[PDB]
């Protein structure tokens, strides 16, 4: 009977709440009250990469910190050289509706996907010299939202049927499926040691997954609406999320609870992208009022504003060396800040 | 060796830019329409389906969305730069659901500059349903509604000419309130036997572009 199972679920939730409250001895603000402020930081535009035809939905850097890939609903991907503002490749696509793009750590492959429910892998360092489709990965039901490369042979993808998958590119099959979510999964971030990854979905919840075992270990709750952006702390023991209630929160993995919240009275728009810096002191968030804001991760006070985009800001990324920040928006421009 | 690499990069950039201009010339001359709702009929006239047809030497492109869940609050934001959105309504409680979907589409933040064409199919079903022995139950305003003086009846009952303009006015009440001059609505009465739907779409797109140009010049 459903009644006893519901009662047992409520009892377990109450036990979890008591266990969590038994460990909240102090807050982060009280601990960091004596730390000096970071101070005002002003950073200016350095490059403007023009050449796209329609809105830009995703972009990704490379491990070499010089090349990046951009995808637009025009139906093309372009690989740029930031140092000399010269393009290196331009790959035509079959379907013109794209939502994500990825760059392999080695630098040999790129991936794309969207409303066609197919992830396509492209080979760059080819003997003939022309980019071609290497494989098409099929099996999902809804649209693809994000994709990341574990290595040259594994890839993890998140889709709109409330599922995530791990593929083997060579064979073209699924190794493990991840289930548990109720709404569409929007973003995912890999751990620096590629052993774990987090996923954010449209149910105000985020979960920690184990790649080898394929089971969910922790579930985090405390938001108010759908979450769109997720990022990992460089340490590997924290992560930050952005949602549609105009709020960013910081969670921790060893205490299983929210640590801090970032909000302001004048901000009433949503959050699209969230990223950190190298040291972890700075948090960059891109909003829907055509602005990008820089926060202090241990003090919850604003430190600056990035302006210059005439439409909504969709993608955000920080170079591995931490020397640049790249933002792309819906007006078909990329700008590199420093 | 650096100079040689720079020269190679410059040559590659020039070639890519030439190809990009060639692709621009073709992309910027095709009109994109999204169809959501009897749809298949109007179409014979995977994640997504595409069809291409040309009328009067103008290229058009239609998209039908399938194999997706009913939760469509996240992927509807892709279709903001399309020329028009085609809405198909059975028009024969499903009408209330259609009205709520139209209301949600109309007032969305990211679709404030996009216009809607609206097709009301199955009028033949309406004719017999009316003159076969009742819409005062799901709509109690029907008892105080009169056929407008600016109507346009077709030859062949004065109780079928009613309730068509009733559904039309229910759909137009949303359109004419809480909407600026950025987008409009174009309602048409079609059946499965109609063959002139392409011409209606052509004329409506022409009107959309002309009205946008007039708004730009602050002449309207």
């Amino acid at each position, epitope marked *: 009977e459903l009644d006893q199972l519901r009662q047992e679920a409520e009892q377990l939730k109450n036990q979890i709440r008591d266990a969590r409250k038994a460990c909240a001895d102090a807050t982060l603000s009280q601990i960091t009250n004596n730390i000096d402020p970071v101070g005002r930081i002003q950073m200016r535009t350095r490059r403007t990469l023009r050449g796209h035809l329609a809105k830009i939905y995703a972009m990704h850097w490379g491990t070499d910190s010089r090349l990046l890939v951009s995808a637009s609903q025009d139906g093309k991907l372009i690989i740029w050289d930031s140092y000399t503002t010269n393009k290196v490749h331009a790959i035509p696509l079959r379907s013109s509706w794209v939502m994500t793009c990825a760059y392999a750590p080695s630098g040999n492959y790129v991936a794309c996907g969207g409303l066609d429910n197919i992830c396509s892998i492209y080979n760059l360092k080819t003997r003939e010299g022309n980019v071609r489709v290497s494989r098409e990965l099929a099996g999902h039901t809804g649209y693809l939202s994000c994709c990341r490369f574990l290595d040259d042979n594994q890839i993890v993808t998140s889709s709109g049927d409330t599922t995530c998958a791990l593929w083997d590119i060579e064979t073209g099959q699924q190794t493990t499926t991840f289930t548990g979510h109720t*709404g569409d999964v929007m973003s995912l971030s890999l751990a620096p040691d590629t052993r774990l990854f987090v996923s954010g979905a449209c149910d105000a919840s985020a979960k920690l997954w184990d790649v080898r075992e394929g089971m969910c270990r922790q579930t985090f709750t405390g938001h108010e609406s759908d979450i769109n952006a997720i990022c990992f702390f460089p340490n590997g023991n924290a992560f930050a999320t952005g949602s549609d209630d105009a709020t960013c929160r910081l969670f921790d993995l060893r205490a299983d609870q929210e640590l801090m919240t970032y909000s302001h009275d004048n901000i009433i728009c949503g959050i699209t992208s969230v990223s950190f810096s190298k040291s972890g002191r700075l948090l960059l968030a891109g909003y829907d009022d055509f602005n990008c804001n820089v926060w202090d991760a241990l003090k919850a006070d604003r430190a600056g504003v990035l302006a210059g985009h005439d439409n909504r800001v969709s993608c955000l990324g920080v170079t591995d060396d931490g020397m640049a920040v790249a933002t792309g928006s819906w007006d078909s421009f990329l700008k590199i800040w420093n | 060796d650096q100079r040689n690499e720079e020269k190679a990069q410059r040559e590659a950039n020039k070639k890519i830019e030439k190809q990009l201009q060639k692709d621009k010339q073709v992309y910027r001359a095709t009109h994109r329409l999204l169809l959501l709702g009897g749809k298949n009929t109007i179409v014979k006239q995977s994640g997504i389906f595409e069809t291409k047809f040309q009328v009067d030497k103008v290229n058009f492109h239609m998209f039908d969305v399938g194999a997706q869940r009913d939760e469509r609050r996240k992927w509807i934001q892709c279709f903001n730069d399309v020329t028009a959105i085609i809405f198909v309504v059975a028009s024969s409680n499903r009408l209330q659901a259609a009205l709520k979907l139209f209301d949600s589409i109309w007032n969305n933040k990211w679709l404030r500059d996009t216009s809607v064409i609206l097709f009301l199919n199955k009028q033949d079903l309406l004719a017999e349903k009316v003159l076969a022995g009742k819409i005062e139950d*799901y709509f*109690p305003e029907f008892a105080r509604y009169t056929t407008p003086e600016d109507a346009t009846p077709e030859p062949g009952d004065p109780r079928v000419t009613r309730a068509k303009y009733f559904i039309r006015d229910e759909f137009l009440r949303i359109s004419t309130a809480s909407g600026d001059g950025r987008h409009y609505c174009y309602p048409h009465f079609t059946c499965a036997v109609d063959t002139e739907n392409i011409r209606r779409v052509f004329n409506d797109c022409r009107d959309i572009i002309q009205r946008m140009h007039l708004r730009q010049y602050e002449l309207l």
Partner: nanobody
Amino acid sequence: QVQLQESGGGLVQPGGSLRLSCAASGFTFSNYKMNWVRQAPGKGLEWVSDISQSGASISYTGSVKGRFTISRDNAKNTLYLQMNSLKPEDTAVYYCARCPAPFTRDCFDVTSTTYAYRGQGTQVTV
């Protein structure tokens, strides 16, 4: 966490009266638009009423006008829905749904199945 508990259902004779309530915890009640949906036996979800963040705008479906009245108490975080002049065709489970995003006029994906922000529901039988 977000949670919506509703109560007040039961069995009433034709021409009766009932008052259903919903208690909301986990979000700012004054920033959202609230709804009432119902599911008849062997049918899909159907929209009944709506309410704005201040109570100015109220809309009802065609078959319930005059019979049903809606209310909103922001101080106590409660949503009511007064029912009178009941008819046998009103036997269903009644849910309480909330708009996905705050400070928004549109309301997407409320009458859909597998919707996150919705309660368990109270059974009403006539």
